[PDB]
From a paper:
Calcineurin is an essential virulence factor that is conserved across human fungal pathogens, including Cryptococcus neoformans, Aspergillus fumigatus, and Candida albicans. FK506 acts on fungal cells by binding to FK506 binding protein 12 (FKBP12) and forming a complex that binds to and inhibits calcineurin by sterically blocking substrate access to the active site. FKBP12 is a member of a larger family of proteins called immunophilins that bind to immunosuppressive molecules and mediate their activity.
Here, we report the first crystal structure of a fungal FKBP12 bound to FK520 that was instrumental in the design of FK520-based analogs. FK520 (ascomycin) is a natural FK506 analog that is modified at the C-21 position with an ethyl group replacing the C-21 allyl group in FK506 (27). A. fumigatus was selected for FKBP12 structure analysis due to the readiness with which protein crystals form and the presence of key conserved fungal residues in the 80s loop. A. fumigatus FKBP12-bound FK520 X-ray crystal structure reveals conserved binding pocket structure. We also report the first fungal FKBP12-FK520 protein crystal structure at a high resolution of 1.7 Å. Phe88 is a conserved residue in many pathogenic fungi that differs from the mammalian His88 residue. The A. fumigatus FKBP12-FK520 structure clearly shows that both the C-22 and C-21 residues of FK520 approach the Phe88 residue. This proximity and potential for a steric clash suggested that modifications at the C-22 position on both FK506 and FK520 could introduce a high degree of selectivity.
Numbering used by the authors:
A (entry chain A): 15 to 25, 29 to 141
B (entry chain B): 28 to 141
Amino acid sequence: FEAQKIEWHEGSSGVTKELKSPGNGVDFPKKGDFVTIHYTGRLTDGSKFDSSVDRNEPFQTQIGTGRVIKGWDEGVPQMSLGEKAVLTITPDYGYGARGFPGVIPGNSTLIFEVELLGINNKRA
Amino acid sequence: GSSGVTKELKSPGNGVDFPKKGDFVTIHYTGRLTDGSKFDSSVDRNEPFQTQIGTGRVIKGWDEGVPQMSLGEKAVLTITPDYGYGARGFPGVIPGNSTLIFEVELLGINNKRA
Ligand SMILES: CC[C@@H]1/C=C(\C)C[C@H](C)C[C@H](OC)[C@H]2O[C@@](O)(C(=O)C(=O)N3CCCC[C@H]3C(=O)O[C@H](/C(C)=C/[C@@H]3CC[C@@H](O)[C@H](OC)C3)[C@H](C)[C@@H](O)CC1=O)[C@H](C)C[C@@H]2OC
Ligand SMILES: CC[C@@H]1/C=C(\C)C[C@H](C)C[C@H](OC)[C@H]2O[C@@](O)(C(=O)C(=O)N3CCCC[C@H]3C(=O)O[C@H](/C(C)=C/[C@@H]3CC[C@@H](O)[C@H](OC)C3)[C@H](C)[C@@H](O)CC1=O)[C@H](C)C[C@@H]2OC
């Protein structure tokens, strides 16, 4: 099976994934998979609030199990290995009314540049 | 060596109402490191903290310690890192492998008040 999810939206509130550069179109994360991702997170005014690239530390998590914000748990499984995409996440799929203290204001839409570098032991 | 979660009573609650897993709790807290430095306090913001307890939304030491408090109780919760933030710590706030000392006041259980 092969596919490229060039645009994907789930919800208006919700999450949008826009493919920027294709992955291999074959390997997609499933629930419970461990993913390795490089990301940069920005607010809608363009200001950066975090970046794994800036600290040269790829981020790893189990996907689809509620360990990350909902926009990532829903959006990352729509990426294939090696894909670069942009995730736009409304507050309902992010940090909601409170935001994240010290980093993200309440009621913030989030824009993540994400690169899927790994799915379990598969590497881009 | 040894690790774990210890609760020391400072002022008793009503001794009758205890949070069950899945209950909402309303709590005032101050968190300190073992060197005495304060890293956070709901009291300083004068904003009670609310969470659902026993469902993994907070560190293990709170999920384990708070259900042993009765309504209105003031206690000190000491939490070794394996029941807190572990080797990772919390970025910008809690060093890796930190024991945590929380002053905890159980202000409410669901809609119950003292
Ligand atoms: C206990 C510490 C542990 C930290 C790490 C393992 C290091 C890791 C690199 C986080 C960053 O450390 C510099 C840093 O990254 C952010 O800047 C970010 O860019 C983001 O938003 N990320 C990050 C990338 C994925 C999407 C999104 C996210 O889901 O992060 C999760 C998160 C904060 C989830 C909350 C948990 C409570 C819950 O109520 C809430 O529900 C809405 C969701 C992180 C990975 C936690 O699972 C683990 C940690 O927190 C956010 C703002 C703060 C975060 O720092 C703490
Ligand atoms: C999505 C944002 C959301 C924030 C709030 C709702 C505001 C609330 C007032 C937190 C403070 O905001 C000023 C502030 O409080 C601390 O200072 C603290 O004093 C502590 O330690 N607390 C806090 C008191 C209970 C015990 C302990 C704790 O469990 O907090 C949880 C926590 C951080 C759990 C992580 C989640 C990822 C997971 O991987 C990790 O596993 C080890 C545990 C908080 C309440 C999350 O449920 C929700 C938020 O994070 C910690 C250091 C950081 C925290 O700020 C973000």
